[PDB]
C-alpha cells in the first residue's frame, strides 16, 4: 500500500508504517505522535482526536471516550453497567447492545461502539494518508490479549467502517514483542514479559515464543489502573493547595478541575525527565491565577501505593505461567506511563537489576510492531 499498523487505544491511538526497513511513527496535524481516542459532537460539527479532547472541559455530555470498554460487549454485561456510572455521556440499550447517545446539530443520535471507534480509525487513516501522500487501505489493528471473539470482531468492524481492509487483528503484547524483533527465530523458546501501563489500563502478559509462533502463557493486571489515576492524585493534591491558599474550593467547578487536570497531566510528563515541574494556570477560579510547582519526589509519594501495586500482577502472571522471575528472557515496557522513572525502578528492582527494553517510546511500541506485521502480511 504500504499497509499500516494502528494501535487503537483506550486513551490514545497511534499509527505507523514500515518502509525501507524502518518503522515511521506518524505525527498528526498538530505534530503529535499519538492522538486522543476521543470523538465529540456539537451544535455544528463532529470533532475527533486532539480537537475533541481540547473541548472536553466544556462539552462533557457529548464528548465520547472509552468506546474500547464497550466494544463487542452486551448491554447487560456487569462491566458495562459498572462503567456507565462513571461516564458523563449516556449509554443506552438497543436490543441488548450498548450505544452511546449524544446530541449533534440539535438532534439526539446514538452510535454503536464500533462506529465511535471507526471515527478514531478514520482519523488515524487520514494521518497516515497525509504523511504518505497516498491512499491507505490495508492495516493491522491491535487489541488486548484478553479480548474475546466478539470484541475482536467489533474492533475489526470499526476498521472496515473506516474504509480499512483489516489484514489481521493481533494482540497488543505480541505487537510490542515484534517491535523489538523478539519474533525472530533463535532456536530455543524464549519467555517475554510485557509490562504495559497506559492511560487507563495496566496489562502484564507473559509470552513464550518459538519459531516465530507466539503463545500467551498468562495475563494479569487491572483494567482500571492507568496514568489518569496518577493525574487524579495530583489534582486532589492541588485542589487542597488552592483551598489552603485562597480559602476557596474549586471541586464543583468542572472547567476549573479540567484545566487543573490538564496541567497536572502535562506536569507529570515533565517529571519523567526533570525533577520539578511548574504549573501556571491563569484565572483558574474566580479570576485567581494558580502558579505553583511540584517535585518528582512529591509526585512519587502521592502515587506510591499505586506504583508499588503494579508488582502484584507481575508476581501473579509469573505464578500463572509457572515461571520464576529468572526465566524471563526479556522485559518490554509498553504504555506511556512506563516512562515514569519510579515505575522503571520498581520493575527493575523486582527483577534484580535486569535491564528493560525501553528504547522504543512505550506509547508507540504497539503501533510500531503492528506496522512491522502489516508489512509482513502485505
Ligand atoms: N512522559 C510521560 N510520563 C508519564 N506519563 C506519560 C508520559 N507520556 C505519556 N504518558 C501517559 O500515558 C498515558 C496514555 O497513553 P498510552 O499512550 O499510554 O495510551 P493508552 O492508554 O491508550 O494505551 C497517559 O496517562 C499519559 O499521561
Ligand atoms: Cl490530526
Ligand atoms: Cl523504590
Ligand atoms: K495507545
Ligand atoms: K494498557
Ligand atoms: Mg495501550
Short mmCIF file of C-alpha atoms in Angstrom, two decimals, residues 8 16 31 38 111 129 157 169 185 190 200 220 270 296 299 308 321 335-336 355:
data_model
loop_
_atom_site.label_atom_id
_atom_site.label_comp_id
_atom_site.label_asym_id
_atom_site.label_seq_id
_atom_site.Cartn_x
_atom_site.Cartn_y
_atom_site.Cartn_z
CA UNK A 8 -6.47 1.70 18.73
CA UNK A 16 2.97 3.59 11.97
CA UNK A 31 2.72 17.25 15.34
CA UNK A 38 -11.93 10.92 21.61
CA UNK A 111 -23.75 5.18 17.87
CA UNK A 129 -2.50 9.40 4.22
CA UNK A 157 -15.68 -3.91 12.09
CA UNK A 169 -6.29 -8.30 14.46
CA UNK A 185 13.97 -17.46 15.34
CA UNK A 190 12.01 -17.60 24.85
CA UNK A 200 -6.46 3.72 31.71
CA UNK A 220 -2.76 -10.17 34.62
CA UNK A 270 7.78 16.71 32.53
CA UNK A 296 9.25 14.43 41.24
CA UNK A 299 4.60 13.14 42.68
CA UNK A 308 4.17 -0.29 44.08
CA UNK A 321 2.82 -19.05 33.75
CA UNK A 335 2.28 2.32 27.65
CA UNK A 336 3.10 5.97 28.20
CA UNK A 355 17.68 -4.27 32.02
#
